[PDB]
């Protein structure tokens, strides 16, 4: 009948517990040892300059008010006990719309070790912001950040720290790559302190370095552009007596280049500078227009 003794243990733990007070409120600064396990790096939306990432966000602090002494060492409790204790309010500094999964039960976990060391993991789907400088499109490389810190707890109260060597904290699953356009190279973690109007906060940062794959842009822009330029220069080997043929060549190649520029600019965000593909398309347009001008002069 271990049910009764374990119920008594739990009721002794929560008897006289105030979940509005961080552990060690008077004489200590709480130390939250975080960790991340990226189950799948979601598709990097280039239009919204965002990216999705599905994580196992782990945290672990030391609560001395949750010490017990029973037959078991670690209490692997239900995810509904985590709402009756104090849990750090980690928010993502750049997350846009994050969801916490509730299928079929709340995807959370809580293991209370016998010496008070808690462990609290969640399964999140963070849609963070990745500002992109598309000046080398489509040969660009980005570093999408993921900054998370505490809300309402300054640096004098709750400090964050990685749980393993900072190089081994953010782990990415092997088969977890929903990236069809980019190519994930590696992560890079860092820890700093941001000032504010309310206080000084500890901020943990994680950059995922990306590298766009040029195959699709090649196939759908550079091949049609080059083929159009070739089809345009074909108009020089025709004899000078056939005027309508060369006129058709010139006009249709100019129209094809125009529609190619239009279809190539639709893929990108509505950006206000010129990309590399833009320069390539401009030069190909110049070449076809020069072919037409040469035919007109002839």
């Amino acid at each position, epitope marked *: 009948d271990n049910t009764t003794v374990f119920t008594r243990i739990l009721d002794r733990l929560l008897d006289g517990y105030d979940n509005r007070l961080r552990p060690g409120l008077g004489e200590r600064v709480t130390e939250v040892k975080t960790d991340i396990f990226v189950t799948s790096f979601g598709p990097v939306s280039d239009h919204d300059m965002e990216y999705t990432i599905d994580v196992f966000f782990r945290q672990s602090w*030391k609560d001395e008010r949750l010490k017990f002494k029973g037959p078991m060492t670690v209490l692997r409790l239900n995810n509904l006990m985590a709402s009756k204790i104090w849990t750090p309010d980690t928010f993502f500094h750049n997350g846009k719309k994050s969801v916490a999964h509730n299928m079929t039960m709340p995807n959370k976990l809580l293991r209370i070790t016998e010496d008070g060391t808690l462990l609290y993991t969640m399964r999140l789907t963070v849609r963070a912001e990745c500002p992109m400088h598309l000046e080398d499109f489509p040969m660009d490389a980005h570093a999408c950040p993921l900054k998370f810190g505490s809300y309402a707890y300054t640096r004098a109260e709750v400090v964050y*720290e990685w749980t393993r060597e900072p190089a081994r904290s953010v782990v990415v699953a092997e088969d977890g790559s929903r990236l069809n356009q980019y190519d994930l190279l590696g992560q890079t*973690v*860092d*820890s700093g302190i941001v000032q504010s109007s309310t206080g000084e906060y500890v901020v943990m940062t994680t950059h995922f370095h990306l590298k766009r794959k040029i195959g699709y842009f090649v196939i759908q822009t550079y091949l049609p552009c080059i083929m159009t330029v070739i089809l345009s220069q074909v108009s020089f080997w025709l004899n000078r007596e056939s005027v309508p043929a060369r006129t058709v060549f010139g006009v249709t190649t100019v129209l094809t280049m125009t529609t190619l520029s239009i279809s190539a600019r639709n893929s990108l965000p509505k950006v206000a500078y010129a990309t590399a593909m833009d320069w390539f398309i401009a030069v190909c347009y110049a070449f076809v227009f020069s072919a037409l001008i040469e035919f007109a002069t002839v």
Partner: antibody
Amino acid sequence: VQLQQSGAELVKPGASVKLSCTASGFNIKDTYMYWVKQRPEQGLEWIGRIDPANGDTKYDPKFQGKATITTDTFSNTAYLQLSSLTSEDTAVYYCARKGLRWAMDYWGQGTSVTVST
Amino acid sequence: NIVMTQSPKSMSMSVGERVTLSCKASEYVGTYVSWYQQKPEQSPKLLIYGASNRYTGVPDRFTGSGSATDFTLTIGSVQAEDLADYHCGQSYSYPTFGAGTKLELK
């Protein structure tokens, strides 16, 4: 808060020495425990670390197999055992705990081992 | 294995002048470079945990300066008891220290 290492050792080449590091002022289950060697008039060198909560120990690639790191949670002690030692590792061995930003804030005092005949 | 090239190898400087030490990391180490001060016949003492964060009990004449790879330790008004080794060690990966700089008085 206060790390007490062992005393100096005078070991013959080809034997095993087990140095102890007793931590007083905290529990070793909270932090890691690094072992560092330093030959005379040279730079510091990492041997290995141990997570006393689990027992996961990592070693420097050039110290794998030669040294082993164990713990004792009841007495809050870390043990470093040099399995097979030559006459070259006559260095000073320090015991340190990880600090706030993964630094080594509290060091030991050094057990200067000596290998000779 | 991340290697830390610390410079210079050994410098000699008089009292009361500003001095600077450099520690260039091979790979990336965000701000996990620590500076330790080892006096002769003693155990190393942590001066700068992380880049540019003095440890409790360190005089304000020690200052760190961090980056991705290059790091700097500047001492201001140098006193007479600052004659010791100064090691820089990263912690972004498994810890690897530098060679150290023998500070001297002349």
